[PDB]
Design an enzyme around this catalytic site. Structure first.
Site, PDB file in Angstrom:
ATOM      1  N   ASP A 167       8.301  -5.251  -2.330  1.00 60.33           N
ATOM      2  CA  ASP A 167       7.041  -5.395  -1.601  1.00 60.33           C
ATOM      3  C   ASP A 167       6.367  -6.731  -1.890  1.00 60.33           C
ATOM      4  O   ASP A 167       5.196  -6.789  -2.229  1.00 60.33           O
ATOM      5  CB  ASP A 167       6.112  -4.211  -1.905  1.00 60.33           C
ATOM      6  N   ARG A 171      -0.770  -9.888  -0.280  1.00 61.41           N
ATOM      7  CA  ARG A 171      -1.548  -8.744  -0.825  1.00 61.41           C
ATOM      8  C   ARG A 171      -1.172  -8.283  -2.266  1.00 61.41           C
ATOM      9  O   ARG A 171      -1.994  -7.662  -2.922  1.00 61.41           O
ATOM     10  CB  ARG A 171      -1.512  -7.548   0.126  1.00 61.41           C
ATOM     11  N   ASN A 172       0.061  -8.559  -2.711  1.00 58.78           N
ATOM     12  CA  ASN A 172       0.554  -8.229  -4.052  1.00 58.78           C
ATOM     13  C   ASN A 172       0.672  -9.439  -5.004  1.00 58.78           C
ATOM     14  O   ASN A 172       1.411  -9.379  -5.987  1.00 58.78           O
ATOM     15  CB  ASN A 172       1.910  -7.499  -3.904  1.00 58.78           C
ATOM     16  N   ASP A 185       2.708  -5.561  -9.223  1.00 55.11           N
ATOM     17  CA  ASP A 185       3.208  -4.348  -8.614  1.00 55.11           C
ATOM     18  C   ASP A 185       1.996  -3.442  -8.393  1.00 55.11           C
ATOM     19  O   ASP A 185       1.372  -3.000  -9.388  1.00 55.11           O
ATOM     20  CB  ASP A 185       4.217  -3.684  -9.544  1.00 55.11           C
TER      21      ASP A 185
HETATM   22  C1  LIG Z   1      -2.474  -4.023 -10.407  1.00 56.79           C
HETATM   23  C2  LIG Z   1      -3.178  -4.214  -9.049  1.00 56.79           C
HETATM   24  C3  LIG Z   1      -4.502  -4.958  -9.137  1.00 56.79           C
HETATM   25  N1  LIG Z   1      -4.755  -5.667 -10.229  1.00 56.79           N
HETATM   26  C4  LIG Z   1      -5.880  -6.372 -10.446  1.00 56.79           C
HETATM   27  C5  LIG Z   1      -5.922  -7.107 -11.736  1.00 56.79           C
HETATM   28  N2  LIG Z   1      -4.898  -7.036 -12.617  1.00 56.79           N
HETATM   29  O1  LIG Z   1      -6.865  -7.825 -12.008  1.00 56.79           O
HETATM   30  C6  LIG Z   1      -6.895  -6.406  -9.425  1.00 56.79           C
HETATM   31  N3  LIG Z   1      -8.102  -7.125  -9.607  1.00 56.79           N
HETATM   32  C7  LIG Z   1      -9.175  -7.426  -8.705  1.00 56.79           C
HETATM   33  C8  LIG Z   1     -10.142  -8.361  -9.149  1.00 56.79           C
HETATM   34  C9  LIG Z   1     -11.240  -8.720  -8.370  1.00 56.79           C
HETATM   35  C10 LIG Z   1     -11.427  -8.160  -7.104  1.00 56.79           C
HETATM   36  N4  LIG Z   1     -12.533  -8.552  -6.319  1.00 56.79           N
HETATM   37  C11 LIG Z   1     -13.925  -8.249  -6.730  1.00 56.79           C
HETATM   38  C12 LIG Z   1     -14.802  -9.516  -6.607  1.00 56.79           C
HETATM   39  C13 LIG Z   1     -14.676 -10.090  -5.181  1.00 56.79           C
HETATM   40  N5  LIG Z   1     -15.665 -11.176  -4.908  1.00 56.79           N
HETATM   41  C14 LIG Z   1     -15.994 -11.323  -3.465  1.00 56.79           C
HETATM   42  C15 LIG Z   1     -17.167 -12.299  -3.243  1.00 56.79           C
HETATM   43  N6  LIG Z   1     -16.907 -13.588  -3.924  1.00 56.79           N
HETATM   44  C16 LIG Z   1     -17.891 -14.650  -3.614  1.00 56.79           C
HETATM   45  C17 LIG Z   1     -16.658 -13.409  -5.371  1.00 56.79           C
HETATM   46  C18 LIG Z   1     -15.446 -12.485  -5.584  1.00 56.79           C
HETATM   47  C19 LIG Z   1     -13.209 -10.528  -4.986  1.00 56.79           C
HETATM   48  C20 LIG Z   1     -12.305  -9.288  -5.051  1.00 56.79           C
HETATM   49  C21 LIG Z   1     -10.486  -7.222  -6.632  1.00 56.79           C
HETATM   50  O2  LIG Z   1     -10.615  -6.644  -5.399  1.00 56.79           O
HETATM   51  C22 LIG Z   1     -11.527  -5.551  -5.278  1.00 56.79           C
HETATM   52  C23 LIG Z   1      -9.389  -6.861  -7.427  1.00 56.79           C
HETATM   53  N7  LIG Z   1      -6.627  -5.670  -8.325  1.00 56.79           N
HETATM   54  C24 LIG Z   1      -5.488  -4.957  -8.110  1.00 56.79           C
HETATM   55  N8  LIG Z   1      -5.321  -4.236  -6.917  1.00 56.79           N
HETATM   56  C25 LIG Z   1      -6.198  -4.411  -5.747  1.00 56.79           C
HETATM   57  C26 LIG Z   1      -5.938  -3.304  -4.719  1.00 56.79           C
HETATM   58  C27 LIG Z   1      -6.980  -3.451  -3.603  1.00 56.79           C
HETATM   59  O3  LIG Z   1      -6.828  -4.726  -2.964  1.00 56.79           O
HETATM   60  C28 LIG Z   1      -6.739  -5.910  -3.773  1.00 56.79           C
HETATM   61  C29 LIG Z   1      -5.913  -5.753  -5.064  1.00 56.79           C
END
Ligand SMILES: CCc1nc(C(N)=O)c(Nc2ccc(N3CCC(N4CCN(C)CC4)CC3)c(OC)c2)nc1NC1CCOCC1
Length: 301
Positions: A167, A171-172, A185
């Site tokens: 995958d 997005r990943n 993953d």
């Molecule tokens: C293992 C899968 C996974 N790991 C991580 C990880 N290891 O850290 C992870 N982190 C992550 C970190 C931050 C955010 N944000 C919040 C702040 C936002 N703002 C917007 C406004 N701007 C000005 C400033 C930043 C930007 C997005 C996040 O998205 C909600 C995810 N996410 C994972 N899975 C998701 C599944 C849903 O889709 C995306 C990936």
């Protein structure tokens, strides 16, 4: 039934279909990875699927306190075991700058938690999309080239570890400090097609994956080509405006390839096209790709 999309494989012959998947279910988990539950202070939910969720947390004394991403199941025993297998796989893989690395786990006194590095800017697709007005805070052509290079490096590491990502897509890939990117993953999403037990990322899949269910590192090169198109379009859906239906399957079978996206140079586009060779043996390797992108990037005036 839950399954990780990063899989270890063992080759059993020279043809693409001669391999099997390594199940870590019968192997023992190395207890040096075990971390105390109570040293996690849970913050917000980062994402949910059907079978589980990824939550932000502060981790005390895991590296001093840091942010982490904690993968967990929703409130069966088969689901539990699959998460343990993934844990065992990630303990054995080793670490790399361009992978979302395992930091520890909580497995003994409560629900299973897998603790990963936190990537503060989220997924690369949403990152690219949020930078569309701000392309010359500011995103450049060189940054796009750097992202491509880093993903290829990540995949080269996985190739070296005898792994396949089933995958690979923007997005990943996650984004952290210093414009570092990391391959990770993991119904409502139109990029996955339902087909019995399977949830298929059709527009990212190599022909041999679509038609025969074969996943090799060379299938990943195809997907990597699609991911390149995502980078150099600033996150446009592949095959834009073409639905996923039986005509899509025919398009791919006949050798249909996307056009050059707007932010790609001609040289980047030739690389993309080579990734989409129908015959898997004509596709470049990941070490080839890291060399080509490194050379493109090394033209920073
Ligand atoms: C293992 C899968 C996974 N790991 C991580 C990880 N290891 O850290 C992870 N982190 C992550 C970190 C931050 C955010 N944000 C919040 C702040 C936002 N703002 C917007 C406004 N701007 C000005 C400033 C930043 C930007 C997005 C996040 O998205 C909600 C995810 N996410 C994972 N899975 C998701 C599944 C849903 O889709 C995306 C990936």
């Amino acid at each position: 039934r839950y399954e990780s999309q990063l899989q270890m494989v063992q080759v059993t012959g020279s043809s693409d279909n001669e391999y099997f998947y390594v199940d870590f279910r019968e192997y023992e988990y190395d207890l040096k990875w075990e971390f105390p539950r109570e040293n996690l202070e849970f913050g917000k939910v980062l994402g949910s699927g059907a079978f589980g969720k990824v939550m932000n947390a502060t981790a005390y004394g895991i590296s001093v306190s840091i942010q982490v991403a904690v993968k967990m199941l929703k409130e069966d025993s088969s689901e539990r075991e699959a998460l343990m297998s993934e844990l065992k796989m990630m303990t054995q893989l080793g670490s790399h700058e361009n992978i979302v690395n395992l930091l520890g786990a909580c497995t003994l006194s409560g629900p299973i938690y897998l603790i990963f590095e936190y990537c503060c800017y989220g997924d690369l697709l949403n990152y690219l999309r949020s930078k569309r007005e701000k392309f010359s805070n500011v995103l450049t052509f060189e940054d796009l080239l750097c992202f491509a290079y880093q993903v290829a490096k990540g995949m080269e590491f996985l190739e070296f570890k005898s792994c396949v990502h089933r995958d690979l897509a923007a997005r990943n890939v996650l984004v952290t400090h210093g414009k570092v990117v990391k391959i990770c993953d993991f119904m409502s999403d139109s990029n996955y097609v339902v087909r019995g037990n399977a949830r298929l990322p059709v527009k990212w899949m190599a022909p041999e994956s679509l038609f025969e269910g074969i996943y090799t590192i060379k299938s990943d090169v195809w997907s990597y080509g699609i991911l390149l198109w995502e980078i150099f379009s600033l996150g446009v859906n592949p095959y834009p405006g073409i639905p996923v239906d039986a005509n899509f399957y025919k398009l791919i079978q006949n050798g249909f390839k996307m056009d050059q996206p707007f932010y790609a140079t001609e040289e980047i586009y030739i690389i993309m096209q080579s990734c989409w060779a129908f015959d898997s043996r004509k596709r470049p390797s990941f070490p080839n790709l890291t060399s080509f992108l490194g050379c493109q990037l090394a033209d920073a005036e």
